[PDB]
Write a protein that binds this DNA or RNA. Structure first.
Ligand SMILES: OC[C@H]1O[C@@](CO)(O[C@H]2O[C@H](CO)[C@@H](O)[C@H](O)[C@H]2O)[C@@H](O)[C@@H]1O
Ligand SMILES: OC[C@H]1O[C@@](CO)(O[C@H]2O[C@H](CO)[C@@H](O)[C@H](O)[C@H]2O)[C@@H](O)[C@@H]1O
Ligand SMILES: [Mg+2]
Length: 580
DNA sequence: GCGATCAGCGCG
DNA sequence: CGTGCTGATCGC
């Protein structure tokens, strides 16, 4: 039967106890400047549902929300914190976030609502959000009676689940990871998302106009060389033009038809002039649809800022993800796409963009965890790691390392990090397995400590059932015991890769926490805007650059102490593009 | 037609 | 290797 609760018309004192499960419901997936549809509070005095117009206007309730001594347990407190920031209300005292707790216990569960986390502890007296709000075009906020009970049941679940979740985190030695890292980081991400990044829309629009011109020209050139018109963006129609009308060789096949990936086209380029044009068309087309039109779609017209949402509880490695827009994959590798960054500017006049990035943090982390003497010495000498790798695997002096040799050694360092494998490397360097295996073997011959680590971590994953990062993040790998070579191999590569990528994630997250504490102590106006896996982007008055040049790198380099140094490069400029 | 897939490409 | 976003596509 239904759950008992008071559907209050006004805020009372017992609703303001110093310990409670709190629900500040924001149904819109993108919570920026979004509506709060209801509030539920469960504490020692009972269960309560409050209408937002009432609670959020009540001085006492707002004070309670902002009182750090009044502890609240929630699910996705960042969502509520940001929704409240847009209304000028501060949320403090969140001592437990069920979403983050569940995430740390097992990222693989994909916990995205209270019901999912509750199911982990055999608690099912709460419905999944999707069941209550529906989804897609049919998504909608239910009538008060249905809404109120759902919010109360969620608060009730959080109230009941706090202790068991904290107990397991403690057994896993992950309690500090939640309380001292992820929860404090949650508040920092909330400030970052709320601050947003300023966009020079006029510059973006002009770039868009020129791209349209260039696309038109390349588009026509393509129809000319094809002898007809067709939907270039249709892998099916394109496949017909390339492999049937033009008789280009089929080197790669796709489940549905002909593969037209850039990888394939690159090899087909020598056969026909249409290929290079299709490649150029896709490059510009990607820029136009995603980084110009797509970006312009999410810019707030009143402030000209984009407010991303950092998903802190999604990746299996501990990395953050970014959406609406995704600001972690803005072009940089190719100059034409890199120009897109000229569109991201400081939010205030006479302010500048400051970007700091870790130099090879993953390989440094690997040197530390594997305790490989050669790799540690390489970083202690701050050597060019790819040139050094080439020197060792190809057995030549530094001056004997050719450009192609370094390129291949670089690709090997790529593979060693993401889980070295014949297929992966071979196909990546466009070579054979017999050859790729030879490189790998040569690499392990030069870095025996890394080989030992790879063997040991795999064995450890099979024994314990999971692998861990420097700060105790965990990833379960049940497929590590699969009798299917492919499935088992993937699991083994994750056993190898996760402690590396995951520890690098732990480090930069701590750096963000340490950095914000330093910025505040120094009372600098500088603030974080974005995190891109191994780099931090800030904006600050031009008068703070010299101080940031010393502070940011130091804080990032000292976040943790490894057997090898951590090195941070940095640049600043009038736009993100110039922060190079 | 709606949402779900597929195929291709951007980043670390 | 992973997330995420795009235009096409197919599924019921
Ligand atoms: O609020 C972020 C937080 O919510 C979850 C669901 O619990 O994701 C929702 O919000 C994201 C940001 O708008 C969307 O990308 C996602 O589709 C939506 O379900 C968590 O995954 C996330 O940590
Ligand atoms: O030849 C041993 C070598 O193979 C790997 C896979 O590259 O693991 C295989 O052999 C182990 C026994 O030594 C099994 O536990 C594992 O399941 C199987 O795939 C390496 O880890 C190992 O060094
Ligand atoms: Mg870097």
């Amino acid at each position: 039967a239904k759950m008992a609760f008071t559907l209050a018309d006004r805020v009372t004192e017992e609703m303001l106890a110093d310990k409670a499960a709190l629900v500040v419901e924001v149904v819109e997936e993108n919570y920026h400047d979004a509506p709060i549809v209801g509030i539920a509070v469960v504490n020692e005095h009972g269960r309560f549902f409050l209408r937002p117009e009432t609670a959020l206007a009540d001085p006492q309730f707002v004070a309670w929300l902002g009182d750090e001594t009044k502890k609240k347990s929630m699910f996705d407190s960042k969502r509520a914190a940001v929704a409240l920031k847009w209304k000028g209300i501060e949320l403090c005292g969140v001592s437990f976030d069920l979403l983050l707790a569940a995430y740390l216990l097992d990222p693989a569960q994909g916990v995205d609502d209270v019901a999912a986390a509750a199911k982990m502890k055999q608690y099912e007296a709460v419905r999944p959000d999707e069941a209550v709000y529906g989804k897609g075009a049919k998504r909608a906020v239910p009538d008060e009676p249905v809404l109120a009970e759902h919010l109360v049941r969620k608060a009730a679940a959080i109230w009941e689940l706090e202790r068991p979740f904290l107990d397991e985190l403690r057994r896993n030695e992950q309690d500090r990871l939640l309380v001292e890292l992820e929860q404090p980081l949650s508040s920092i991400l909330a400030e970052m998302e709320f601050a947003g990044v300023k966009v020079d829309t006029k510059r973006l629009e002009q770039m868009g106009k020129e791209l349209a011109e260039q696309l038109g020209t390349v588009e026509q050139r393509i129809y000319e060389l094809a002898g007809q018109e067709f939907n270039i963006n249709s892998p099916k129609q394109l496949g017909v033009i390339l492999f049937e009308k033009l008789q280009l060789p089929v080197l790669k096949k796709t489940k549905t038809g002909y593969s037209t990936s850039a990888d394939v086209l690159e090899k087909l380029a020598p056969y026909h002039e249409i290929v290079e044009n299709i490649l150029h068309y896709r490059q510009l087309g990607k820029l136009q649809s995603t980084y110009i039109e797509g970006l312009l779609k999410v810019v707030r017209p009143d402030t000209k800022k984009v407010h991303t949402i950092f998903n802190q509880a999604l990746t299996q490695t501990g990395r953050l993800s970014s959406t609406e827009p995704n600001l972690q994959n803005i072009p940089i590798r190719l100059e034409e796409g890199r120009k897109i960054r000229q569109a991201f500017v400081p939010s205030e006049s006479d302010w500048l963009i400051f970007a700091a990035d870790y130099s090879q943090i993953e390989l440094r982390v690997l040197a530390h965890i594997a305790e490989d003497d050669n790799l540690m010495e390489a970083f202690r000498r701050d050597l060019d790691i790819h040139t050094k790798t080439a020197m060792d695997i190809f057995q030549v002096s530094e001056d004997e390392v050719t450009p192609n040799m370094r390129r291949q050694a670089k690709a090997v360092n790529f593979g060693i990090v993401y889980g070295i494998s014949d297929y992966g490397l071979a196909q990546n360097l466009n070579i054979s397995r017999k050859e790729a295996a030879e490189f790998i073997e040569r690499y392990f011959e030069s870095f025996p400590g890394v080989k030992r680590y790879m063997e040991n971590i795999v064995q450890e994953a099979k024994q314990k059932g999971y692998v861990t990062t420097l700060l105790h993040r965990r990833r379960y790998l049940p497929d590590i015991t699969s009798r299917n070579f492919n499935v088992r191999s993937f699991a083994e590569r994750m056993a190898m890769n996760t402690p590396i990528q995951g520890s690098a994630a732990d480090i930069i997250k701590k750096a963000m926490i340490d950095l914000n504490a330093r910025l505040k102590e120094e009372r600098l106006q500088a603030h974080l805007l974005l995190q891109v896996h191994d780099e931090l982007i800030l904006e600050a008055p031009k008068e703070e650059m010299e101080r940031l040049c010393r502070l940011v790198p130091e804080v990032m380099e000292q976040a943790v102490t490894l057997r090898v140094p951590l090195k941070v490069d940095y640049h600043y400029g009038s736009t993100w593009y110039d922060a190079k």
